[PDB]
Amino acid sequence: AFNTLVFSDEFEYEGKPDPEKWHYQVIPPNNGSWHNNELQHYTNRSENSFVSDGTLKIRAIKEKYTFEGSTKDYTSARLNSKFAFTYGKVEVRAKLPSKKGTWPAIWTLGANSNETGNYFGEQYGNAEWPACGSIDILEQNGWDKESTIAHFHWSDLNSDEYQNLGGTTPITNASGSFHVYSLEWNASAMKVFLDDTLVYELKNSQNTPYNAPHYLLLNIAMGGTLGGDIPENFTDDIFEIDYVRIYQ
Ligand SMILES: OC[C@H]1O[C@@H](O[C@@H]2[C@@H](O)[C@H](O[C@@H]3[C@@H](O)[C@@H](O)O[C@H](CO)[C@H]3O)O[C@H](CO)[C@H]2O)[C@H](O)[C@@H](O)[C@@H]1O
Ligand SMILES: [Ca+2]
Q1: What residues does ligand 1 touch, defined as CB less than 6 Å away?
Q2: Three-state SS at 115
Q3: Start and end of every GH16 domain (predicted)?
Q4: Taking Cα atoms as reference points, which of 11, 150, 17, 161 lies closest to residue 94?
Q5: Facing residues of 162 across strands?
Q6: Residues in CB range of 232: below 8 A, 6 or more apart
Q7: In contact, 193 and 245? CB cutoff 8 Å
Q8: What is the rounded distance in angstroms from the CA atom of residue 186 to the CA atom of residue 67?
Q9: With contact defined as beta carbons under 8 Å apart, do 97 and 80 qualify?
Q10: Could you tell me which of 139, 125, 141 has the C-alpha nearest to residue 192?
Q11: Which residues partner with 197 through β-bridges?
């Protein structure tokens, strides 16, 4: 159904993520910290993201880092697409971090999120999460690298009731072998796959925030709710992305 390519990055250049395509988040949203009790700051430096040899790397590092008076013990990157879209098929081919404590994600936020320091501000609205909606195409927690997560977080348009549900699936060699993490999203349903396996399908409806533009996020959080305990010896780890493609 989704046969027209509308956004892609094949990462076949060298240096910073293409600034026509990617926006960095660096300002923490919660008084000097990220959410979910996560332990990193996110930066735009070559320490934490770079493109080389046909692939994007996001790299989390145990490193003391201070931003605007708030010191953390880890650094990473959190990218947002400067493409916003309503419906489509998103495909991201990647290798995931292997190390305990890492929490990689490939996900979306409604573009009316107005999250601090994002790219779209109040252009589309001002719907504080979860009312803006989100789709998790991929997460892994810190303690089980043999499973992936797909999940949805939202409140219905006629509600302040927060909903959150999804599924998981087994994965083999998530760090050493590329897999394709994908979403097929239309007015009827949102389906998340790992290669050809359906991880979760949620029916769409007008009562949901999944009928207006979303943007993509790519990140590695450290610690926090799904990162869990980080080994004392942690040095650094990479989330390597061969491409992002979006079709409509
Ligand atoms: O909106 C203010 C509200 O924010 C809540 O923080 C949420 C985070 O819980 C949420 O975490 C993401 C997960 O839902 C899941 O989508 O996967 C991603 C990637 O792993 C997680 O980051 O992210 C949204 C958007 O940044 C935050 O708004 C606080 O918990 C809550 O107290 C506060 O009111
Ligand atoms: Ca590539």
Answers
A1: 35-36, 103, 105, 107, 109, 115, 128-129, 134, 136, 139, 153
A2: coil
A3: 1-248
A4: 11
A5: 155
A6: none
A7: no
A8: 39
A9: no
A10: 139
A11: 194
